[model samples]
Target: HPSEPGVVSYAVLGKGSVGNIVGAPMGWEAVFTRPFQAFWVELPACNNWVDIGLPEVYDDPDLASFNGATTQTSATDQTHLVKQAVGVFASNDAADRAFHRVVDRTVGCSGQTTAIHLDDGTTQVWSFAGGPSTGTDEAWTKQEAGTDRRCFVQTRLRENVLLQAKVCQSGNAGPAVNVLAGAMQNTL
Candidate 1:
C-alpha cells in the first residue's frame, strides 16, 4: 500500500531512494506499516530503548502527519532492519522544534547502554558511541555490547519536513544510512 501524500514509506527507500544499505546475501522485504500517530524511533540509548513516541509532537495542533516504514530479514539468528520515518508540520518552525526534539534526545542518550527486548522474550544490548560520526549534526553510531553488530543513523530537515534513517546490521551498514535519508528528502 502507498502512504498518503506528505508521508514517506518503505517505497521511499525501496524504489525512489537508494537501494538496501545492508547488502546482505539477500535483499530486504518491507513489512511493518508505521501508523499516522507519533514521530518515534529506536534512538540508540534514548527513552530507555523504548519508543516513548513523542505524543507531544503528535498533540500539537500544527503537526500535520506522521509516517515511516521498516524492512527486515534474518541472519546470524538476528534480524537486520532498515527504517525511515518522517514528520511534516504546518510551519517550518514547528518542524524545527519537532526535529530538534528528537535530536536533543539523541544528544542526551549518548554513551549509554540500551537494552532492547526481542520478539522471543530475549534482550539484546547496544551501546551508543556518539559517532563514528557524520558531517550532519544529529547523526550517530551504536554497537552491540559484545559483538561487532552496529547501527548507523542520520536525520535531516528541510523546510517543514523532518526525516530520519537507520540501518542496523552486523555488517558494514555504516554511513550508508545517510544516502537513504538524503535521497528520501528529495520528495520534500
Candidate 2:
C-alpha cells in the first residue's frame, strides 16, 4: 500500500510546520503503530521534520550528532519485518556530515556480534557485515552477516533542507529503499 509519490503529508510535531511526507507501504493485513518513547526523544531536536518509522539502531548519546530522527516499522504477526527511518538536519552540510557518521558507525559494527533482546524475553544474535556498495548521491546499504536483514540509507539536499532515509528490512528488498528515499526527497 505504498501511497503515490507524496500523499503522506503532515505537520512536524510540536512545531506545527507542514511538509510533504511519505511512508513505507502499508501492506495488506499489515499492522502499524508508533513507538512513542522514541518519537518523544526525537521531537525536541528535529527542527520541524516528522520521524515516521521504527526504533533506532543506537540510542541517544550514540546518535547525538543527528539533529532529528524518526523510525517507522512495517510488520506482520506482531513481529517487525521492516523499519524505515527519516533523519533531518539543519542544512545540507550538516546532513552530509551525519550521513557519513552513520556509515562509519554501521561499518564499525560490522564483523562484530551483537544481541537484541525483545520484550517477549527472546534474544536474537546479529552478526553484521558491510553490504555491497550502493552509492548514489549519498546512499548505501549494510547487512547482517548471513541474514537478509539489511539497512539502507540515502541523503539528499532540498534548498536548505537536508534529509535522509534509513530503511532496514529482513529480506532481500531491492531498489525500494532508494525509491522511498528518493520520493521523500522530492517532498522537501
Candidate 3:
C-alpha cells in the first residue's frame, strides 16, 4: 500500500549495523521498499531498493529546488533538495560502469553556472563547484545569491551498488548534506 504524506513509515538505512556510520536514525516524510518481482517493458522492475526520507527543512513547497525524482527504465534515484539512488545491473561490472556515468555527468557540469526561473517570476543564478569532499565518494555544492538557498549532491559506490544523495538548505549546509550522503550509502 502507498503511504500517507507527512507520516513516518519506515526506518532509515543501516539503522542497526555495528561500525556503520550510515546507520543513523532518519525521520521520513515517506518510505518505500520492495524486492523486484517481475520485469516490465518500461522499467525492468529494478531490484531491492529503499526510499530514505528527507528532513522537514524540505517540506516547504516555496523552496526553489528540484523535488526528488526517480526513474526505473534507466535505474536512477535522486534526493529531495537531497537525492539518493539504488540500482542493480546485469553484473557488478555493469553497475560500476553505470555508476561512472552519473559521476561523469556531475563532473562534466562542475563549475558551470545555471539560472532557474522561480514561480514568483524572479530568476536565481546558482554557482556550482566540485569536490566538496565528505571523504565519502564524491560531492558537489551549489549556492544562490543573497539568500540561504544552497544545494549539495553527494555520491558513493559500493561494489555494484550506486548511491547519490542530495540535500538543499536555506543556509550553509555542506556538513549536513555530506552526512545525508554517507548515511544513504547504507541503503545500498
List TM-score per model, in order. Answer: 0.71, 0.47, 0.50
Tens digit per residue, CA lDDT, model 3, 57-167: 122222222123222111232222333444433345554555454454344445555655444556556666676444236566766656567766665655544455555
Encode model 1's per-residue lDDT on 1-188: one tens digit a residue.
Answer: 22233554432555223344554433444433343332223554264223312354333666676666655663332356676667666787776777666655556677777676655567767787655433234667778899878888776666676666787777667656866676676666
| Models, CA RMSD each | 5.4, 10.1, 13.7
Error of 1 at 153 (Å): 0.6
Better of 1 and 3 by TM-score: 1
Model 3 residue 94 CA deviation in Å: 1.8
Index of the highest-lDDT prediction? 1
Give Cα-based local distance difference scores for all models.
Answer: 0.58, 0.38, 0.40
What lDDT would candidate 2 get against the real structure?
0.38
